[PDB]
Each structure stands twice: as C-alpha cells, then as structure tokens.
C-alpha cells in the first residue's frame, strides 16, 4: 500500500491570497516523481491539475504550481480566486517490479474568506397536497450567509425539537461567496395538525433569528 496525508484538511483565504497545501506520502513515490494534484469543483468529476510533481497540464491556470520530492509535496495557489473553491487531492503512486499502488490524500477543502453575512430566513408550511400523503415537511431556508456555520433549532408550540430534522448546505456561491442552508422538519400529519405554532431559530454569532407561522392562517 501507499497513503497520502494532506495538510491542512480545510482552509479559508481571501481573494488574492497565497495558499499552500502539503502532502506526505507513506512511501517513496515511483521514480521519486509520480505524484499528481487533482481538483474537484462542486458537482464535477475530478480534474488533474499537475502531474509528475510540477508539470502543469495544458489549460490549467498558471497560479497552480507543485513542488517537492521523495515523500513531501506541496501545491501552491499563488492568488486564490473564487473559482478555486474545490477539494484538492494529491495522488501518489508506489511502484516496484512487484508493486503498483495508488492513493489519494484525504482532500483539502478551500473556500473564499469574506465578511460575515447574516442569512435571510424563510419558513414554509407543508402544502395541503403533501398532508394528504400522511406526512408534513416544514422547510426553513437560510439564504446567502457567511461563514458556513449556523445553528438551526426547530420549535413546535415552543417545544424544542430533536431528531426529526435534516439539513443540507450549498457550495460556496461563485459570485457573492455566501452559502445557503435548508432545514427540513418532518412530522406525521397527525402531529402537525395537533400543534399550532411552528418556528425555526437560526443562530449566527450573537444573533438568533426566529421565523414562525401559525398553522392554517
């Protein structure tokens, strides 16, 4: 086997910052040079950026450069751009006449650092159409916030909910560098029609924002 260990595992940097990602192979890579760097943007297959430690592939932006030898390798982004939001992998090959193993590093997430932005919070009751299926989904939207971290808490007639919500986050927006999050509270039709006030509470820093509705209004 061979493995690759990348550092850091995630980073934030401002537009135009220099970014450095390091990678340590558990074995000497083949011919001391068989290391590539891959980039995976959101919703895309992986794309090779650099091969043989430092060779930039045709059509890869020139702010990407690779360095190192033996078992220690480094990817440098000289001037971070929003389009660089991706997970980056070093890929190493261990070879001998009786060996041929490859490994990806664990990946390094890169995002753009910007100023904090408060989310715009919207809450949606279940449709009457879904209720006839026996299930009620209450959706809470947190739109265009930064940074990615936020706490969402569901309240039903002031009772804190637990274990019946699921959350999902977008990738960083290429233009405003914000994220968006959805929290969906799932209830039985019986439970939903039994209570009145539904509230989603969003906490970012020193601010909590709660959007609510009363059932059937």
């Amino acid at each position: 086997d061979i493995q690759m260990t990348q550092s850091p595992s995630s980073l934030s940097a401002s537009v135009g910052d220099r970014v450095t990602i390091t990678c340590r192979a558990s074995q000497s890579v083949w011919r001391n040079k068989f290391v590539a760097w891959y980039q995976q943007k959101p919703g895309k297959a992986p794309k090779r950026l650099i091969y043989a430690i430092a060779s930039l592939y045709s059509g890869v932006p020139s702010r990407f450069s690779g360095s190192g030898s033996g078992t220690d390798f480094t990817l440098t982004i000289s001037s971070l751009q929003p389009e660089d939001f991706a997970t980056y992998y070093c890929v190493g090959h261990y070879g001998s006449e009786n060996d041929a193993y490859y490994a990806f590093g664990q990946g390094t997430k890169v995002e753009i650092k910007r100023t904090v932005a408060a989310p715009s919070v919207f809450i949606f009751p279940p449709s009457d159409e879904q209720l006839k299926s026996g299930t009620a989904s209450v959706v809470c939207l947190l739109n265009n916030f930064y940074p990615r971290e936020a706490k969402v808490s569901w309240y039903v007639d002031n009772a804190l909910q637990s274990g019946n919500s699921q959350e999902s986050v977008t990738e960083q927006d290429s233009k405003d560098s914000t994220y968006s999050l959805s929290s969906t509270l799932t209830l039985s039709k019986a439970d939903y029609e039994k209570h009145k006030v539904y509230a989603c509470e969003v906490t970012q820093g020193t601010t909590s924002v709660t959007k609510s509705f009363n059932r059937g209004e």
Binding site: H93, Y102, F104, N143, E167, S180, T184, K211
Partner: protein
C-alpha cells in the same frame, strides 16, 4: 480516446457489483488502469490497479472483496466487489490517473447504490411564496422534491430561463431509504402576481419528469 463505465445501478445489501470499463481509440492492454470511487460526502478512494501487463494490485481495504480483470476481446477492464455495504454506495470511475505521465484519462463514472429500496420517482411539493416568505421586495419560493430513489434528480426553473437566485440543495437520505431535496429561488415580490414559476424536476432512473407550478399562498 474515451473510457466508458457500464454496469452501474442498484445492488441489494450484501450483493455484488459488476462494472465494466470500455476503451475507445486504443487497446485496453496498452496501459494500466485504476478503479476509483467516491462515496457521497467523502474523498476519492483508490480501489485497485491492473498493470499494462495484466497483473492486478488491490488497495488493502479492497483486496478481500474485489476482483479486477481484463477482456482484450471486448477491450474492457472489469471490477467485481461482493458483500456490498451501505458505505459502498458511490460513483465508480475507471481511470489512468497520470501521476507521472502526461497521459491521463477518466471515464465519466457510474453510480452504484447499495440499498434495499426500489426505484421511485419523486413527489414534488410546492414551497409557496406568501406574506411570510416575503421580506422587503424579495420573495422566496421553491419545490420540495421528496421520496425518490436512486440519485440523482436535476432541477431547473421555468425551463432554464430563471437561474439567478436559484439554490438546489444536496439530496439527503431519509430514514425510509428514499432521497429528498429542496430547490429554492428568490424573486422580486412584485412579480408574484404576474410571473409564473415552474420547477422542472427530472429523475432519469425512473424516466420521470415533474413540472410543478408554484403558486402564491
């Protein structure tokens, strides 16, 4: 030149996958090829490698369950894996990784879903704009795409004429074993009485397309 994976689809828990990788524009035995995969929300993972000479080396985690072979007649390299786990649900690629050479090539990848659920098209419920999902002159609306299997769905708005402010969230796997996601869009509140908003949901695995008009209130 082209690599094309085939044999993807559904596998019951504890079953086996059988994937083929068909080369176009060259003979499959002029190079060595890798099988790689990526589970949802995880990093890329090397499975095994078949040298140009036809010898199969496996990453240790995969060796006990996996078999990689070659069929020069059909110009294919094959992957078989047994006792499939939930954690084996992933997009699988064949690839010459190009860690040291300029020649790299990847297939487009094929999804393998390891589950006891069966194929089901989505129910698409409105996330209606209201006085509550309006703040200032911005209204939020969307569609809840619930209870489909397997991944993926694609969502557009008004046949692709509307993309600004659209957020289509990653799918979540519900306890039922079916997937769910919401797609949302913010629009001028002043458009709600005039403009028609239709989400177009496509679920290729079930050959189902749903167009849901989202009306206010």
């Amino acid at each position: 030149v082209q690599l094309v994976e085939s044999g993807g689809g559904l596998v019951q828990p504890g079953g086996s996958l059988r994937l083929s990788c068909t080369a176009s524009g060259f003979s499959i035995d002029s190079y060595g090829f890798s099988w790689v995969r990526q589970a949802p929300g995880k990093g890329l993972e090397h499975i095994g490698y078949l040298t140009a000479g036809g010898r199969a080396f496996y990453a240790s985690w995969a060796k006990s369950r996996s078999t990689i072979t070659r069929n020069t007649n059909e110009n294919t390299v094959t992957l078989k894996m047994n006792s499939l786990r939930a954690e084996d649900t992933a997009v699988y690629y064949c690839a010459k990784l190009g860690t040291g050479s300029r020649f790299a090539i990847w297939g487009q990848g094929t999804l393998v879903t390891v589950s006891s659920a069966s194929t089901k098209g989505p129910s698409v419920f409105p996330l209606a704009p209201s006085s509550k999902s309006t703040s200032g002159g911005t209204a939020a609306l969307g569609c809840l795409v619930k209870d489909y299997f397997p991944e993926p769905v694609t969502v557009s708005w008004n046949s692709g004429a509307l993309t600004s402010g659209v957020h289509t969230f990653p799918a979540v796997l519900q306890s039922s074993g079916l997937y769910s996601l919401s797609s949302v869009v913010t629009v001028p509140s002043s458009s709600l009485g005039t403009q028609t908003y239709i989400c177009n949901v496509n679920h290729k695995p079930s050959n189902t397309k749903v167009d849901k008009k989202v009306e206010p209130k």
